[PDB]
Structure formats: C-alpha cells, structure tokens
Coordinates of C-alpha atoms and ligand atoms in Angstrom, one line a residue:
Chain A
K24 CA -106.3 143.6 59.0
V25 CA -108.2 141.8 56.0
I26 CA -111.6 141.6 56.1
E27 CA -113.6 139.6 53.2
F28 CA -117.2 139.1 51.6
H29 CA -118.5 136.4 49.8
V30 CA -121.7 135.3 48.7
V31 CA -121.4 131.3 48.8
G32 CA -123.2 128.4 48.0
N33 CA -123.1 124.4 47.8
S34 CA -124.6 123.9 44.3
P39 CA -118.3 121.9 46.1
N40 CA -114.7 123.1 46.4
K41 CA -112.0 123.0 49.3
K42 CA -112.0 126.5 50.5
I43 CA -115.7 127.6 50.9
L44 CA -116.5 124.2 52.3
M45 CA -114.6 124.8 55.1
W46 CA -116.1 128.7 55.3
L47 CA -119.6 126.4 54.8
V48 CA -118.5 124.7 57.8
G49 CA -117.3 127.8 59.3
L50 CA -120.7 129.6 58.8
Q51 CA -122.6 126.4 60.0
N52 CA -120.2 126.4 63.6
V53 CA -120.7 130.7 63.8
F54 CA -124.3 130.1 63.6
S55 CA -124.9 126.8 65.9
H56 CA -123.0 129.0 68.4
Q57 CA -124.9 132.2 68.4
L58 CA -128.6 131.0 67.4
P59 CA -129.4 128.7 70.5
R60 CA -133.1 128.2 69.5
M61 CA -131.8 126.0 66.3
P62 CA -130.8 122.7 66.1
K63 CA -127.1 122.2 64.7
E64 CA -128.8 119.7 62.2
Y65 CA -131.4 122.1 61.0
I66 CA -129.0 124.8 60.5
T67 CA -126.7 122.3 58.5
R68 CA -129.5 121.5 56.2
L69 CA -130.7 125.1 55.2
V70 CA -126.8 125.9 55.3
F71 CA -126.1 123.0 52.8
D72 CA -129.3 123.3 50.9
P73 CA -128.2 124.8 47.2
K74 CA -131.9 126.8 47.5
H75 CA -129.7 129.2 50.2
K76 CA -127.0 130.8 49.4
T77 CA -124.6 132.4 52.3
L78 CA -123.0 135.7 52.6
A79 CA -119.6 134.9 54.9
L80 CA -117.7 137.8 56.9
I81 CA -114.1 136.5 56.2
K82 CA -111.6 137.8 58.5
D83 CA -107.7 136.6 58.6
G84 CA -108.9 133.6 56.4
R85 CA -111.7 132.9 59.3
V86 CA -115.3 133.0 59.2
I87 CA -116.7 135.6 61.7
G88 CA -120.0 135.9 60.5
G89 CA -122.4 135.7 58.0
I90 CA -126.0 136.0 56.9
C91 CA -127.8 132.9 55.1
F92 CA -130.5 134.0 53.1
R93 CA -132.9 132.3 50.7
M94 CA -134.0 134.1 47.0
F95 CA -137.4 133.7 45.4
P96 CA -137.2 135.9 42.4
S97 CA -140.5 135.2 41.6
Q98 CA -142.1 136.5 44.8
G99 CA -139.9 139.6 44.6
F100 CA -138.9 139.2 48.4
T101 CA -135.9 137.3 50.2
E102 CA -136.1 135.7 53.3
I103 CA -133.0 136.0 55.6
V104 CA -132.5 132.8 57.7
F105 CA -129.4 133.2 60.2
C106 CA -127.5 135.7 60.5
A107 CA -124.8 136.0 63.1
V108 CA -121.6 137.4 64.1
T109 CA -119.0 135.4 66.7
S110 CA -119.4 136.8 70.0
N111 CA -115.4 138.5 69.8
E112 CA -116.4 140.5 66.9
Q113 CA -120.1 141.9 67.8
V114 CA -120.8 145.4 68.5
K115 CA -118.0 146.7 65.9
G116 CA -120.7 147.6 63.5
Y117 CA -119.7 144.0 61.5
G118 CA -123.7 143.2 61.3
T119 CA -124.6 146.6 60.0
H120 CA -122.0 145.9 57.4
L121 CA -123.2 142.4 56.3
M122 CA -126.7 143.6 55.8
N123 CA -125.3 147.0 53.7
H124 CA -123.4 144.4 51.5
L125 CA -126.1 141.7 51.3
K126 CA -128.2 144.7 50.6
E127 CA -126.5 145.8 47.8
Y128 CA -125.9 142.2 46.2
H129 CA -129.9 142.7 45.8
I130 CA -130.2 145.8 44.4
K131 CA -128.4 144.4 41.2
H132 CA -130.4 140.8 41.1
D133 CA -133.4 143.6 41.6
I134 CA -135.3 142.4 44.9
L135 CA -136.3 145.1 47.0
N136 CA -137.9 143.4 49.9
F137 CA -136.5 141.9 53.2
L138 CA -138.3 139.0 54.9
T139 CA -137.2 137.7 58.4
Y140 CA -138.9 135.8 61.5
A141 CA -137.2 137.6 64.1
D142 CA -135.8 136.5 67.6
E143 CA -137.2 138.3 70.7
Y144 CA -133.6 139.5 71.5
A145 CA -132.2 141.1 68.3
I146 CA -135.8 143.1 67.0
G147 CA -133.1 145.8 68.0
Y148 CA -130.9 144.9 65.3
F149 CA -133.3 144.6 62.5
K150 CA -135.2 147.6 63.1
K151 CA -131.6 149.6 63.0
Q152 CA -131.3 147.9 59.6
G153 CA -134.6 149.3 58.5
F154 CA -137.0 146.3 59.4
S155 CA -140.0 146.9 61.0
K156 CA -142.9 144.9 62.1
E157 CA -145.5 146.2 59.4
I158 CA -145.1 144.5 56.2
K159 CA -145.5 146.4 53.2
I160 CA -145.4 143.5 50.7
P161 CA -148.8 141.5 50.4
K162 CA -149.5 138.1 52.6
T163 CA -150.5 136.4 48.9
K164 CA -146.7 136.9 48.3
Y165 CA -144.8 134.9 51.2
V166 CA -147.4 132.9 52.9
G167 CA -146.1 129.1 52.0
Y168 CA -142.8 130.0 50.7
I169 CA -141.3 131.6 54.1
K170 CA -140.3 129.3 56.8
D171 CA -142.7 130.2 60.0
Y172 CA -140.7 130.3 63.2
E173 CA -141.9 129.5 66.8
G174 CA -142.3 132.9 68.3
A175 CA -139.8 134.9 66.3
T176 CA -141.8 138.1 65.1
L177 CA -142.1 138.7 61.2
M178 CA -140.3 142.2 59.9
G179 CA -139.9 143.2 56.4
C180 CA -137.7 145.7 55.1
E181 CA -138.2 147.5 51.5
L182 CA -135.1 148.6 50.3
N183 CA -134.6 151.4 47.0
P184 CA -132.8 152.4 44.3
Chain B
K24 CA -134.1 104.2 69.8
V25 CA -132.5 103.7 65.8
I26 CA -128.6 103.5 66.5
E27 CA -126.6 103.2 63.4
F28 CA -123.3 102.5 62.5
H29 CA -121.7 103.8 59.1
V30 CA -118.1 104.3 57.8
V31 CA -118.3 107.5 55.8
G32 CA -115.5 109.9 54.2
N33 CA -115.6 112.7 51.1
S34 CA -113.9 110.1 49.0
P39 CA -121.8 114.9 46.7
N40 CA -124.9 112.5 48.6
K41 CA -127.2 115.0 50.8
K42 CA -127.0 112.8 53.8
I43 CA -123.4 111.8 54.4
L44 CA -122.5 115.6 54.1
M45 CA -125.3 116.2 56.8
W46 CA -123.4 113.5 58.8
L47 CA -119.8 114.9 58.0
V48 CA -120.5 118.5 59.1
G49 CA -122.6 116.7 62.3
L50 CA -119.5 114.7 63.1
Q51 CA -117.3 118.1 62.4
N52 CA -119.3 119.6 65.5
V53 CA -119.3 116.6 68.1
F54 CA -115.6 116.6 67.3
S55 CA -114.7 120.3 67.5
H56 CA -117.2 120.9 71.2
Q57 CA -114.9 117.7 72.5
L58 CA -111.7 118.1 71.7
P59 CA -110.7 121.7 72.3
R60 CA -106.7 120.7 71.9
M61 CA -107.6 120.9 68.0
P62 CA -108.6 123.7 65.6
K63 CA -112.1 123.8 64.4
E64 CA -110.6 124.3 60.8
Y65 CA -108.2 121.3 61.0
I66 CA -111.1 119.2 62.4
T67 CA -112.6 120.0 59.4
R68 CA -109.9 119.7 56.8
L69 CA -108.6 115.7 58.4
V70 CA -112.5 114.7 58.3
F71 CA -113.2 116.0 54.7
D72 CA -109.7 114.8 53.6
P73 CA -110.3 111.6 51.4
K74 CA -107.7 109.3 52.6
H75 CA -109.4 109.9 56.0
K76 CA -113.1 107.8 56.5
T77 CA -114.7 108.1 59.9
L78 CA -117.2 106.0 61.7
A79 CA -120.4 107.7 62.7
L80 CA -123.0 106.8 65.5
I81 CA -126.2 107.7 64.6
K82 CA -128.9 108.2 67.0
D83 CA -132.7 108.6 65.7
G84 CA -131.0 111.0 62.7
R85 CA -128.5 112.9 64.6
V86 CA -124.3 112.1 64.7
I87 CA -123.8 112.0 68.2
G88 CA -120.1 110.3 68.0
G89 CA -117.9 109.3 65.8
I90 CA -113.9 108.2 65.4
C91 CA -111.8 109.3 62.3
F92 CA -109.4 107.0 61.4
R93 CA -106.8 107.4 58.3
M94 CA -105.8 103.5 57.3
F95 CA -102.0 102.9 56.2
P96 CA -102.5 99.3 54.5
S97 CA -98.6 99.8 53.5
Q98 CA -97.7 99.9 56.8
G99 CA -100.0 97.1 58.9
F100 CA -101.5 99.9 61.6
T101 CA -104.5 102.5 61.6
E102 CA -103.6 105.7 62.6
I103 CA -106.4 107.3 64.6
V104 CA -106.9 110.4 64.6
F105 CA -110.3 112.2 66.7
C106 CA -112.4 110.4 68.3
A107 CA -115.5 111.3 70.4
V108 CA -119.2 111.1 72.4
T109 CA -121.1 114.3 72.3
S110 CA -121.8 114.9 75.9
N111 CA -125.1 114.3 76.4
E112 CA -124.4 110.7 75.3
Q113 CA -121.3 110.4 77.6
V114 CA -120.6 107.0 80.0
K115 CA -123.5 105.2 78.3
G116 CA -120.5 102.3 77.1
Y117 CA -121.2 104.2 73.4
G118 CA -117.7 104.9 72.9
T119 CA -116.8 101.1 73.7
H120 CA -119.1 100.3 71.1
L121 CA -117.8 102.3 68.5
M122 CA -114.2 101.3 69.5
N123 CA -115.2 97.9 68.8
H124 CA -117.2 98.1 66.0
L125 CA -114.0 100.0 64.6
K126 CA -111.8 97.0 65.5
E127 CA -114.2 94.5 63.3
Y128 CA -114.3 96.8 60.6
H129 CA -110.3 96.0 60.8
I130 CA -109.6 92.8 60.6
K131 CA -112.5 92.5 57.9
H132 CA -109.9 93.9 56.5
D133 CA -106.4 93.2 57.3
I134 CA -105.3 96.0 59.7
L135 CA -104.7 95.0 63.1
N136 CA -102.6 97.2 64.9
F137 CA -104.2 100.6 66.1
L138 CA -102.0 103.6 67.0
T139 CA -102.9 107.1 68.4
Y140 CA -101.7 110.3 69.9
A141 CA -104.0 110.3 73.3
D142 CA -104.4 113.4 74.9
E143 CA -103.9 113.3 79.0
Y144 CA -107.9 112.6 80.3
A145 CA -108.7 110.2 77.9
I146 CA -105.5 107.7 78.0
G147 CA -108.0 106.7 80.6
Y148 CA -110.4 105.4 78.4
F149 CA -107.8 103.5 75.6
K150 CA -106.5 102.1 78.2
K151 CA -109.4 100.3 78.7
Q152 CA -109.9 99.4 75.6
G153 CA -106.7 97.5 75.2
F154 CA -104.5 100.8 74.3
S155 CA -101.5 101.2 76.1
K156 CA -98.1 102.9 76.1
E157 CA -95.8 100.7 74.3
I158 CA -95.7 100.1 71.0
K159 CA -95.0 96.4 69.5
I160 CA -95.0 97.7 65.9
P161 CA -91.4 99.1 64.9
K162 CA -91.1 102.9 65.2
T163 CA -90.0 103.0 61.3
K164 CA -93.2 101.8 60.5
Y165 CA -95.5 104.6 62.2
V166 CA -92.7 107.5 62.8
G167 CA -93.1 110.4 60.1
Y168 CA -96.7 108.3 58.5
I169 CA -98.6 109.5 62.0
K170 CA -99.0 113.0 62.9
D171 CA -97.3 114.0 66.4
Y172 CA -99.7 115.9 68.7
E173 CA -98.1 118.1 71.5
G174 CA -98.0 116.8 75.1
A175 CA -100.3 113.9 74.1
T176 CA -99.6 110.1 74.6
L177 CA -98.8 107.9 71.9
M178 CA -100.5 104.2 72.6
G179 CA -101.4 101.2 70.6
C180 CA -103.1 97.9 70.5
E181 CA -104.0 94.9 68.7
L182 CA -107.5 93.2 68.2
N183 CA -107.9 89.1 67.4
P184 CA -109.6 88.1 64.9
Ligands
COA201 C1 -127.4 140.6 65.9 C2 -126.2 140.5 65.6 C3 -126.1 139.7 64.2 C4 -125.7 141.7 65.1 O1 -124.3 142.4 64.7 P1 -123.2 142.9 65.5 O2 -121.8 143.4 64.5 O3 -122.7 142.3 66.8 O4 -124.2 144.5 65.8 P2 -123.6 145.7 65.4 O5 -122.4 146.5 65.4 O6 -123.6 145.6 63.7 O7 -124.7 147.4 65.5 C5 -125.9 147.2 64.9 C6 -126.5 148.2 65.9 O8 -128.1 146.7 66.0 C7 -127.7 147.4 67.4 N1 -128.6 146.6 68.3 C8 -130.2 146.5 68.7 N2 -130.3 145.5 69.2 C9 -129.3 144.7 69.0 C10 -128.8 143.5 69.3 N3 -129.9 142.6 70.0 N4 -127.4 142.7 68.9 C11 -126.8 143.7 68.5 N5 -127.0 144.3 68.0 C12 -128.3 145.4 68.2 C13 -126.6 147.6 67.6 O9 -126.6 148.5 69.1 C14 -126.4 148.5 66.8 O10 -126.9 149.6 67.2 P3 -126.3 151.5 66.1 O11 -124.8 150.7 65.4 O12 -126.7 152.2 65.9 O13 -125.4 151.9 67.7 C15 -124.9 140.1 66.6 O14 -125.1 140.8 67.6 C16 -125.8 138.4 67.0 O15 -124.7 137.4 66.5 N6 -126.2 138.1 67.9 C17 -126.6 136.6 67.9 C18 -127.0 136.1 67.2 C19 -128.2 136.7 66.8 O16 -129.4 137.1 67.8 N7 -129.2 136.4 65.1 C20 -130.3 137.2 64.8 C21 -130.2 138.3 64.0 S1 -129.3 138.3 63.4
COA202 C1 -113.8 109.4 76.4 C2 -115.6 109.4 75.3 C3 -114.6 108.9 73.6 C4 -116.2 107.8 75.4 O1 -117.5 108.0 75.4 P1 -118.3 107.1 76.3 O2 -119.2 106.6 75.8 O3 -118.4 108.1 77.6 O4 -117.6 106.0 77.4 P2 -117.9 105.0 77.5 O5 -119.3 104.6 78.4 O6 -118.1 103.8 76.3 O7 -116.9 104.0 79.1 C5 -116.3 103.4 78.7 C6 -115.2 103.4 79.9 O8 -114.1 103.7 80.3 C7 -114.1 104.4 80.8 N1 -113.9 106.0 80.9 C8 -112.2 106.5 80.9 N2 -112.0 107.7 80.6 C9 -113.3 108.3 80.6 C10 -113.9 109.4 80.3 N3 -113.3 110.8 79.5 N4 -115.4 109.7 80.1 C11 -116.5 108.3 79.7 N5 -115.8 107.3 80.0 C12 -114.3 107.0 80.6 C13 -115.9 104.3 81.5 O9 -115.9 104.6 83.0 C14 -116.2 102.8 81.1 O10 -115.5 102.4 82.0 P3 -116.6 100.8 82.5 O11 -117.3 101.0 81.1 O12 -115.8 100.1 82.8 O13 -117.5 101.6 83.6 C15 -116.1 110.3 75.8 O14 -116.3 110.6 76.7 C16 -115.7 112.0 74.8 O15 -116.2 112.1 73.5 N6 -114.9 112.7 75.9 C17 -114.4 113.8 75.1 C18 -113.2 114.2 74.3 C19 -112.6 112.9 74.6 O16 -111.7 112.5 75.5 N7 -111.7 111.8 72.9 C20 -110.9 110.9 73.4 C21 -110.7 109.8 72.2 S1 -111.9 108.3 71.9

C-alpha cells in the first residue's frame, strides 16, 4: 500500500540502520550460499551502497551494489526479494530503479556473478553471458564467486 | 578452537558492528516470539549491552541485558545459542560469565521474563519463579513479555 525505494549506505542514523539490518536479514535468508558474516561485511562496507525496497515500514527487498566510476561499470552483489513477495515484479522494479540511478551518475554498465538459479532473472533485465566491457576493466576489481557465471548489462540513455 | 567473550554495545568500530548484527541474527533465529526489528532496536540501544560469544571469528551466542544500578538488578532481554552449538555447555558458560561481570559491578539480582520452553534452562542457572526483590523495585522498569514467566535468582560473590 506504501512502497519506497532508498539507496542507503554506511558511510549512521537510527532508521537506515534498522534498514541495514533488515537488508542483511533479507539477503541471508535468500542467498543460502552466502555466509551471514560475509553479507554483513559487504552490506556495511562504506564502498557499497544498497538500494532498499521498503513496504509499509518493513524491508522486503534490496540490491547491494558497488560502484566503480573509474572502471565505468557497477558490480551487483546481493539482490533479493523476500519469499512472500516474490513474483510480483518487485525485483524488476528494483533493477529498473537501479538502472535509473546509474544513468544520472553516468555508469552505463552492470556486472554480476550469477547464481545458477537466477540467471533466468538477469536475462530478463537484459544481462547476457557475453560481455562487452573489456576484461582489463573489471578483472581484479570485481569479486569472483564459486560456480556463479558472469553476466553483463550495457544500459543506455 | 578460539572462543571469546566480549561485552559489547552501541554506546563506529567495524568489528563490533559485525558482532552486533551477528548477535541480532542469532537472537532472531532462536526467538520466534520476538520480531526481528524489535531485537534490532534493543540490541543497538545505548542503554542495552550484550555479552557476545565469539567462536573462531563468528558470533554463536549472546545475552542481551540492560543494567539497572538505580534498582538493584539487571534485566535479561534476549539470550540464545546458535543451533549448531546448543547442548555444549555454551549457554551455561555465558550465564556464568554474565554473573561474574555483575558481581564485579555490584548488581546481585538477575531478572528475566522466561518463555515457556526455556524455563527448563533458567531453573538450572539458579533461576526461579519466586522473586525476593520487591515488586516495586522492578515493575514498570522491566518489560513484561506475554505468556512468559517472570524469573529471578541471586549470584554469590
Ligand atoms: C530473483 C529475484 C530477486 C526476482 O525478484 P521477483 O520479484 O521475485 O521476480 P519478478 O517478479 O521481478 O519477475 C522477474 C522476471 O524474471 C523471471 N525469472 C526468471 N528466472 C527467475 C528466477 N530464478 N526467480 C525469479 N524470477 C525469475 C520472472 O518470471 C519474471 O519474468 P517475466 O516478468 O518476464 O514474466 C527473487 O525471486 C529472489 O529474491 N530470489 C532468491 C535469491 C536470489 O536468487 N538472488 C540472485 C539474483 S537477484
Ligand atoms: C537454551 C539455550 C539458550 C542454552 O544453550 P545450550 O548451550 O544449548 O545449553 P547448555 O549446553 O549450556 O546446557 C545447559 C543445561 O540446561 C539444560 N537445558 C534446559 N533447556 C534447554 C534447552 N532449551 N536447550 C539446551 N539445553 C537446555 C541442558 O540439558 C543442560 O543440562 P546439563 O548441563 O545439566 O546436562 C539455547 O539452547 C538456545 O539458544 N535456545 C533457543 C532460544 C532460547 O530458548 N533462549 C532462552 C534464554 S537464554
């Protein structure tokens, strides 16, 4: 009934902090292959911001991303919608809003290492297994993950 | 292999933030009758401290308490051991160490509102149902918890 999108960050007021915990809680529930401590580390890392999906006070989704304005792309880390609220298009809205945030900041590229079970969702948001940014841009900067496949998205206007 | 006891709180240290979150996760998994956001609120509250049990870098247990020096007791909010590690004398250790901390701080009585299933566990730690510290001392200072049983016990030097 009321639904909000906030880019948040630990760079730490009381409200966002509740949201930061809520995001960590949402992520750890969906991403079973991610240890809670690791999520907490990245989520609270000041070089990472998280785009939070609030519904009626409560965090229900988010995308954790790290921007590399120098490389000309953004690494997408932990994106999740809570189980209740899956398949209602929330995840596509988050990616859309993420996409618009970045057009303003003039980063036109997304990179992520995709779980096997969610390659489907990224392909819908325009990601491809075939990457158009040269290796020399992201190798080293971006976290490689075990048996996740790397996908890119090249936004526009 | 390494096992630590730290008394923590929100009174921006990067270590204790991760610990406080790690504590919120453990408290949240183990106590269904308490909503995640409530736990977050109290855990990070500057009048609440928490006894963290770290194991090899990671929180596996804790006791959140609020000290009432002006009263003569300490109120026990949450305590829990992560599930891997239950039935290993870990929570007995935590409570023992909590007792020491408070003796060293001149607060002899512990109060808790105990939930239907851990009455067993508190009873062993000297805890009981009959309080010896006057109702007027704690009522309205402590937080009544619904269909929990109030309990209390004293600790020697
Ligand atoms: C993946 C996820 C973030 C998608 O959010 P969502 O709101 O549930 O999915 P949506 O409602 O936005 O639907 C998105 C589209 O991708 C599709 N899709 C393909 N594979 C999918 C998958 N594995 N999960 C969800 N949607 C998927 C949906 O059917 C939908 O297609 P359509 O609208 O064209 O018909 C969410 O389901 C989730 O939290 N999964 C668990 C954790 C995870 O796998 N994270 C990694 C990637 S974010
Ligand atoms: C109850 C709890 C906090 C204790 O941690 P623990 O390490 O498993 O308990 P211990 O290993 O120290 O065992 C303590 C003694 O109390 C007993 N006990 C009573 N209830 C128990 C319970 N629910 N779980 C484990 N032990 C329990 C044990 O048998 C043990 O007896 P013994 O040493 O004489 O053989 C833990 O199981 C937990 O987190 N439960 C979920 C949430 C909860 O009940 N919190 C209550 C407030 S602390």
